[PDB]
Amino acid sequence: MISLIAALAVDRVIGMENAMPWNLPADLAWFKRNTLDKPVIMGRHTWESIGRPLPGRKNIILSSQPGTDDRVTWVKSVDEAIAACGDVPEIMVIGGGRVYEQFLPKAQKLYLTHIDAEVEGDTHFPDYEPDDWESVFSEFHDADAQNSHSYCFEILERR
Amino acid sequence: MISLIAALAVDRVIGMENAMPWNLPADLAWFKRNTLDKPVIMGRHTWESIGRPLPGRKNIILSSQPGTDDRVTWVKSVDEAIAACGDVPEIMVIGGGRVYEQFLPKAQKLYLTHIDAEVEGDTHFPDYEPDDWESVFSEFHDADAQNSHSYCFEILERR
Ligand SMILES: Nc1nc2c(c(=O)[nH]1)N(C=O)[C@@H](CNc1ccc(C(=O)N[C@@H](CCC(=O)O)C(=O)O)cc1)CN2
Numbered sequence: 001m002i003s004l005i006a007a008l009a010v011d012r013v014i015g016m017e018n019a020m021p022w023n024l025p026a027d028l029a030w031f032k033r034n035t036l037d038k039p040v041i042m043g044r045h046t047w048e049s050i051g052r053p054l055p056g057r058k059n060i061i062l063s064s065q066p067g068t069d070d071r072v073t074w075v076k077s078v079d080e081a082i083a084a085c086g087d088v089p090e091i092m093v094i095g096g097g098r099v100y101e102q103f104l105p106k107a108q109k110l111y112l113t114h115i116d117a118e119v120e121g122d123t124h125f126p127d128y129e130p131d132d133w134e135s136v137f138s139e140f141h142d143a144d145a146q147n148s149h150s151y152c153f154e155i156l157e158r159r
Numbered sequence: 160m161i162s163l164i165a166a167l168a169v170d171r172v173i174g175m176e177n178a179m180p181w182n183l184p185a186d187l188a189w190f191k192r193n194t195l196d197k198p199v200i201m202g203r204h205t206w207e208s209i210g211r212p213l214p215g216r217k218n219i220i221l222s223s224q225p226g227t228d229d230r231v232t233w234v235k236s237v238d239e240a241i242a243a244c245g246d247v248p249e250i251m252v253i254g255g256g257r258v259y260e261q262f263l264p265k266a267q268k269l270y271l272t273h274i275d276a277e278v279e280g281d282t283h284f285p286d287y288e289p290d291d292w293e294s295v296f297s298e299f300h301d302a303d304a305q306n307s308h309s310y311c312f313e314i315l316e317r318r
Pocket residue numbers: 164165166174179184186187188189190191205208209213214253254271272
Protein backbone atom coordinates (compact mmCIF):
# COMPACT_ATOMS: atom_id res chain seq x y z
CA MET A 1 0.00 0.00 0.00
CA ILE A 2 0.79 3.63 -0.26
CA SER A 3 0.72 5.83 2.82
CA LEU A 4 1.04 9.64 3.10
CA ILE A 5 2.98 11.12 6.05
CA ALA A 6 2.70 14.79 6.94
CA ALA A 7 2.80 17.48 9.72
CA LEU A 8 -0.14 19.91 9.42
CA ALA A 9 -0.38 23.25 11.20
CA VAL A 10 -3.87 24.79 11.73
CA ASP A 11 -5.79 25.00 8.42
CA ARG A 12 -3.72 22.16 7.00
CA VAL A 13 -0.71 24.34 6.33
CA ILE A 14 2.25 22.08 5.50
CA GLY A 15 4.85 24.53 4.08
CA MET A 16 5.89 28.15 4.08
CA GLU A 17 8.21 30.31 2.12
CA ASN A 18 11.01 29.47 4.61
CA ALA A 19 11.57 26.71 7.25
CA MET A 20 8.45 26.00 9.49
CA PRO A 21 8.66 27.98 12.72
CA TRP A 22 8.71 25.09 15.08
CA ASN A 23 11.07 22.73 16.73
CA LEU A 24 9.59 19.25 17.12
CA PRO A 25 12.19 16.57 17.68
CA ALA A 26 9.48 14.21 18.84
CA ASP A 27 7.64 14.57 15.55
CA LEU A 28 10.85 13.92 13.71
CA ALA A 29 11.33 10.84 15.80
CA TRP A 30 7.76 9.67 14.92
CA PHE A 31 8.53 10.32 11.18
CA LYS A 32 11.70 8.23 11.39
CA ARG A 33 9.89 5.42 13.22
CA ASN A 34 7.21 5.21 10.57
CA THR A 35 9.40 5.51 7.52
CA LEU A 36 12.48 3.54 8.47
CA ASP A 37 13.19 0.56 6.09
CA LYS A 38 10.52 1.86 3.66
CA PRO A 39 11.06 3.57 0.41
CA VAL A 40 10.07 7.28 0.57
CA ILE A 41 8.84 9.38 -2.41
CA MET A 42 9.25 13.12 -2.43
CA GLY A 43 9.32 16.12 -4.66
CA ARG A 44 12.25 18.24 -5.39
CA HIS A 45 11.64 21.09 -2.99
CA THR A 46 11.20 18.65 -0.11
CA TRP A 47 14.47 16.98 -1.18
CA GLU A 48 16.17 20.35 -1.24
CA SER A 49 14.77 21.07 2.17
CA ILE A 50 15.87 17.82 3.74
CA GLY A 51 19.37 18.43 2.73
CA ARG A 52 20.56 14.89 2.35
CA PRO A 53 19.25 11.43 1.71
CA LEU A 54 17.24 10.10 4.62
CA PRO A 55 19.32 7.20 6.09
CA GLY A 56 18.12 3.74 5.94
CA ARG A 57 15.41 4.42 3.45
CA LYS A 58 15.32 4.23 -0.29
CA ASN A 59 14.96 7.85 -1.45
CA ILE A 60 13.04 8.49 -4.61
CA ILE A 61 12.62 11.96 -6.07
CA LEU A 62 9.72 12.63 -8.34
CA SER A 63 10.58 15.51 -10.65
CA SER A 64 10.41 16.72 -14.18
CA GLN A 65 13.90 17.90 -14.27
CA PRO A 66 17.08 15.86 -14.38
CA GLY A 67 18.55 14.93 -11.08
CA THR A 68 21.65 16.20 -9.48
CA ASP A 69 22.30 13.69 -6.73
CA ASP A 70 23.71 10.27 -7.50
CA ARG A 71 22.77 8.90 -4.14
CA VAL A 72 19.07 8.88 -4.72
CA THR A 73 16.68 7.69 -7.47
CA TRP A 74 15.16 10.31 -9.78
CA VAL A 75 11.87 9.55 -11.51
CA LYS A 76 9.61 11.46 -13.74
CA SER A 77 6.31 9.94 -13.13
CA VAL A 78 4.09 8.66 -10.45
CA ASP A 79 4.07 5.33 -12.20
CA GLU A 80 7.79 5.32 -12.45
CA ALA A 81 8.05 6.28 -8.82
CA ILE A 82 5.94 3.33 -7.78
CA ALA A 83 7.71 0.79 -9.90
CA ALA A 84 10.91 2.10 -8.45
CA CYS A 85 9.67 0.89 -5.00
CA GLY A 86 9.52 -2.53 -6.33
CA ASP A 87 8.02 -5.18 -4.16
CA VAL A 88 7.35 -3.85 -0.74
CA PRO A 89 4.45 -3.80 1.51
CA GLU A 90 4.09 -0.14 2.05
CA ILE A 91 5.33 2.96 0.19
CA MET A 92 5.64 6.22 2.07
CA VAL A 93 4.98 9.49 0.31
CA ILE A 94 6.49 12.48 2.11
CA GLY A 95 5.28 15.50 0.13
CA GLY A 96 5.14 18.17 -0.51
CA GLY A 97 1.78 19.69 -1.67
CA ARG A 98 1.66 18.52 -5.31
CA VAL A 99 3.10 15.15 -4.55
CA TYR A 100 0.59 14.59 -1.76
CA GLU A 101 -2.10 15.73 -4.19
CA GLN A 102 -1.23 13.26 -6.81
CA PHE A 103 -0.87 10.30 -4.50
CA LEU A 104 -3.81 10.73 -2.20
CA PRO A 105 -6.32 8.93 -4.46
CA LYS A 106 -4.20 5.85 -4.42
CA ALA A 107 -3.49 6.00 -0.65
CA GLN A 108 -4.89 3.79 2.00
CA LYS A 109 -3.36 5.27 5.17
CA LEU A 110 -2.37 8.71 6.50
CA TYR A 111 0.06 9.31 9.36
CA LEU A 112 -0.56 12.80 10.47
CA THR A 113 0.93 15.12 13.02
CA HIS A 114 -1.46 18.05 13.94
CA ILE A 115 0.53 20.91 15.40
CA ASP A 116 -1.13 23.75 17.30
CA ALA A 117 0.49 26.53 15.33
CA GLU A 118 -1.26 29.30 13.50
CA VAL A 119 0.80 30.33 10.50
CA GLU A 120 0.45 31.86 7.03
CA GLY A 121 1.12 29.08 4.67
CA ASP A 122 2.30 28.65 1.25
CA THR A 123 1.19 25.05 0.61
CA HIS A 124 -1.43 22.97 2.37
CA PHE A 125 -2.31 19.34 2.68
CA PRO A 126 -5.08 18.41 0.19
CA ASP A 127 -8.52 18.42 1.62
CA TYR A 128 -9.39 14.97 2.90
CA GLU A 129 -12.88 13.82 3.71
CA PRO A 130 -13.17 12.81 7.27
CA ASP A 131 -16.20 10.84 6.40
CA ASP A 132 -14.03 8.62 4.30
CA TRP A 133 -11.18 8.12 6.91
CA GLU A 134 -11.11 6.06 10.09
CA SER A 135 -8.89 7.36 12.92
CA VAL A 136 -7.21 4.24 14.39
CA PHE A 137 -4.78 5.91 16.64
CA SER A 138 -4.34 9.27 18.26
CA GLU A 139 -1.95 10.67 20.82
CA PHE A 140 -1.78 14.25 22.29
CA HIS A 141 1.29 15.88 23.67
CA ASP A 142 1.95 19.39 25.10
CA ALA A 143 4.95 21.47 24.16
CA ASP A 144 7.88 20.78 26.50
CA ALA A 145 11.52 21.49 27.08
CA GLN A 146 12.36 20.12 23.75
CA ASN A 147 9.27 20.60 21.63
CA SER A 148 8.02 24.07 20.76
CA HIS A 149 4.36 23.46 20.20
CA SER A 150 1.79 21.08 21.24
CA TYR A 151 1.01 18.28 18.70
CA CYS A 152 -1.01 15.22 18.14
CA PHE A 153 -0.13 12.02 16.32
CA GLU A 154 -2.86 10.45 14.23
CA ILE A 155 -3.11 7.40 11.91
CA LEU A 156 -6.05 7.13 9.51
CA GLU A 157 -7.20 4.25 7.33
CA ARG A 158 -9.38 4.72 4.39
CA ARG A 159 -12.86 3.40 5.12
CA MET B 160 36.63 36.83 31.22
CA ILE B 161 33.08 35.84 31.25
CA SER B 162 30.73 35.90 28.38
CA LEU B 163 27.00 35.44 27.91
CA ILE B 164 25.56 33.91 24.76
CA ALA B 165 21.86 34.11 24.03
CA ALA B 166 19.15 34.09 21.39
CA LEU B 167 16.62 36.94 21.74
CA ALA B 168 13.18 37.36 20.14
CA VAL B 169 11.60 40.78 19.77
CA ASP B 170 11.59 42.70 23.00
CA ARG B 171 14.39 40.57 24.38
CA VAL B 172 12.04 37.64 25.15
CA ILE B 173 14.00 34.47 25.98
CA GLY B 174 12.90 30.93 26.72
CA MET B 175 11.71 29.97 30.11
CA GLU B 176 11.03 26.21 30.06
CA ASN B 177 9.38 25.14 26.71
CA ALA B 178 11.50 25.14 23.53
CA MET B 179 11.30 28.35 21.49
CA PRO B 180 9.07 28.51 18.38
CA TRP B 181 11.72 28.77 15.75
CA ASN B 182 14.19 26.52 13.92
CA LEU B 183 17.59 28.12 13.19
CA PRO B 184 20.30 25.63 12.55
CA ALA B 185 22.65 28.54 11.48
CA ASP B 186 22.25 29.94 14.95
CA LEU B 187 23.08 26.62 16.68
CA ALA B 188 26.18 26.39 14.49
CA TRP B 189 27.13 29.88 15.66
CA PHE B 190 26.55 28.76 19.25
CA LYS B 191 28.70 25.72 18.80
CA ARG B 192 31.59 27.53 17.07
CA ASN B 193 31.66 30.10 19.92
CA THR B 194 31.40 27.72 22.87
CA LEU B 195 33.47 24.71 21.70
CA ASP B 196 36.49 23.87 23.88
CA LYS B 197 35.24 26.19 26.60
CA PRO B 198 33.39 25.65 29.91
CA VAL B 199 29.68 26.44 29.74
CA ILE B 200 27.49 27.36 32.72
CA MET B 201 23.78 26.84 32.49
CA GLY B 202 20.71 26.57 34.79
CA ARG B 203 18.59 23.48 35.22
CA HIS B 204 15.87 24.33 32.61
CA THR B 205 18.50 24.98 29.98
CA TRP B 206 20.15 21.53 30.81
CA GLU B 207 16.74 19.83 30.27
CA SER B 208 16.22 21.64 27.00
CA ILE B 209 19.60 20.64 25.66
CA GLY B 210 18.99 17.07 26.68
CA ARG B 211 22.61 15.77 26.98
CA PRO B 212 26.03 17.09 27.69
CA LEU B 213 27.32 19.49 25.03
CA PRO B 214 30.28 17.68 23.59
CA GLY B 215 33.72 19.22 23.50
CA ARG B 216 32.80 21.52 26.39
CA LYS B 217 32.97 21.36 30.11
CA ASN B 218 29.22 21.30 31.29
CA ILE B 219 28.50 22.98 34.57
CA ILE B 220 24.96 23.03 35.85
CA LEU B 221 23.98 25.73 38.49
CA SER B 222 21.02 24.61 40.58
CA SER B 223 19.87 24.20 44.19
CA GLN B 224 18.64 20.71 43.63
CA PRO B 225 20.59 17.41 43.66
CA GLY B 226 22.28 16.82 40.38
CA THR B 227 21.10 13.79 38.54
CA ASP B 228 23.76 12.85 35.89
CA ASP B 229 27.46 12.14 36.58
CA ARG B 230 28.86 13.38 33.30
CA VAL B 231 28.25 17.06 34.18
CA THR B 232 29.37 19.10 37.11
CA TRP B 233 26.63 20.32 39.46
CA VAL B 234 27.26 23.51 41.51
CA LYS B 235 25.08 25.38 43.98
CA SER B 236 26.50 28.83 43.59
CA VAL B 237 27.93 31.35 41.19
CA ASP B 238 31.23 31.29 42.92
CA GLU B 239 31.30 27.54 42.87
CA ALA B 240 30.42 27.56 39.16
CA ILE B 241 33.28 29.93 38.40
CA ALA B 242 35.78 27.92 40.35
CA ALA B 243 34.71 24.74 38.52
CA CYS B 244 35.76 26.36 35.38
CA GLY B 245 39.33 26.73 36.46
CA ASP B 246 41.92 28.87 34.60
CA VAL B 247 40.66 29.56 31.10
CA PRO B 248 40.55 32.47 28.88
CA GLU B 249 36.79 32.64 28.45
CA ILE B 250 33.84 31.19 30.42
CA MET B 251 30.66 30.93 28.49
CA VAL B 252 27.34 31.62 30.33
CA ILE B 253 24.42 29.92 28.55
CA GLY B 254 21.33 30.83 30.53
CA GLY B 255 18.57 30.91 31.35
CA GLY B 256 17.22 34.17 32.61
CA ARG B 257 18.15 33.97 36.24
CA VAL B 258 21.56 32.65 35.32
CA TYR B 259 22.12 35.45 32.92
CA GLU B 260 20.98 37.98 35.58
CA GLN B 261 23.50 36.59 38.00
CA PHE B 262 26.46 36.74 35.73
CA LEU B 263 25.71 39.91 33.73
CA PRO B 264 27.43 42.30 36.16
CA LYS B 265 30.58 40.17 35.89
CA ALA B 266 30.47 39.86 32.08
CA GLN B 267 32.70 41.58 29.61
CA LYS B 268 31.32 40.06 26.33
CA LEU B 269 27.95 39.33 24.82
CA TYR B 270 27.28 37.11 21.83
CA LEU B 271 23.73 37.77 20.86
CA THR B 272 21.39 36.49 18.23
CA HIS B 273 18.49 38.87 17.45
CA ILE B 274 15.62 36.91 15.96
CA ASP B 275 12.79 38.46 14.09
CA ALA B 276 10.12 36.60 15.89
CA GLU B 277 7.35 37.86 18.07
CA VAL B 278 6.90 35.32 20.83
CA GLU B 279 4.75 35.78 23.82
CA GLY B 280 6.75 35.12 27.00
CA ASP B 281 7.56 35.90 30.62
CA THR B 282 11.28 36.14 30.68
CA HIS B 283 13.47 38.72 29.08
CA PHE B 284 17.18 38.78 28.67
CA PRO B 285 18.40 41.27 31.32
CA ASP B 286 18.36 44.92 30.34
CA TYR B 287 21.81 45.88 29.10
CA GLU B 288 22.51 49.54 28.41
CA PRO B 289 24.48 49.51 25.08
CA ASP B 290 26.20 52.73 26.13
CA ASP B 291 28.21 50.59 28.55
CA TRP B 292 28.79 48.11 25.71
CA GLU B 293 30.21 48.87 22.36
CA SER B 294 28.78 46.82 19.52
CA VAL B 295 31.75 45.32 17.71
CA PHE B 296 30.29 42.90 15.20
CA SER B 297 26.92 42.62 13.55
CA GLU B 298 25.82 40.44 10.67
CA PHE B 299 22.31 39.97 9.43
CA HIS B 300 20.85 36.99 7.72
CA ASP B 301 17.51 36.46 6.02
CA ALA B 302 15.34 33.41 6.71
CA ASP B 303 15.83 30.61 4.24
CA ALA B 304 14.85 27.08 3.53
CA GLN B 305 16.62 25.88 6.65
CA ASN B 306 16.13 28.84 8.97
CA SER B 307 12.71 29.89 10.02
CA HIS B 308 13.26 33.62 10.60
CA SER B 309 15.67 36.40 9.97
CA TYR B 310 18.43 36.61 12.61
CA CYS B 311 21.29 38.98 13.28
CA PHE B 312 24.44 37.94 15.15
CA GLU B 313 26.08 40.62 17.31
CA ILE B 314 28.94 40.77 19.71
CA LEU B 315 29.20 43.52 22.33
CA GLU B 316 32.23 44.38 24.48
CA ARG B 317 31.83 45.94 27.90
CA ARG B 318 33.39 49.39 28.07
N1 LIG C 1 22.91 31.51 20.12
C1 LIG C 1 22.11 30.95 20.97
N2 LIG C 1 22.30 31.02 22.28
C2 LIG C 1 21.47 30.41 23.17
C3 LIG C 1 20.40 29.68 22.73
C4 LIG C 1 20.16 29.51 21.28
O1 LIG C 1 19.24 28.82 20.77
N3 LIG C 1 21.02 30.17 20.47
N4 LIG C 1 19.65 29.01 23.69
C5 LIG C 1 18.41 28.59 23.89
O2 LIG C 1 17.51 29.38 23.62
C6 LIG C 1 20.31 28.67 24.85
C7 LIG C 1 21.08 27.41 24.55
N5 LIG C 1 20.21 26.29 24.01
C8 LIG C 1 20.84 25.33 23.19
C9 LIG C 1 20.07 24.34 22.54
C10 LIG C 1 20.74 23.43 21.74
C11 LIG C 1 22.13 23.44 21.54
C12 LIG C 1 22.80 22.42 20.70
O3 LIG C 1 22.27 21.29 20.59
N6 LIG C 1 24.00 22.65 20.13
C13 LIG C 1 24.86 21.66 19.36
C14 LIG C 1 24.67 21.92 17.82
C15 LIG C 1 24.54 20.41 17.27
C16 LIG C 1 23.30 20.79 16.47
O4 LIG C 1 23.41 21.94 16.00
O5 LIG C 1 22.32 20.01 16.67
C17 LIG C 1 26.22 21.99 19.85
O6 LIG C 1 26.42 23.14 20.33
O7 LIG C 1 27.01 21.02 19.89
C18 LIG C 1 22.82 24.44 22.20
C19 LIG C 1 22.16 25.37 23.01
C20 LIG C 1 21.10 29.79 25.29
N7 LIG C 1 21.93 30.41 24.46
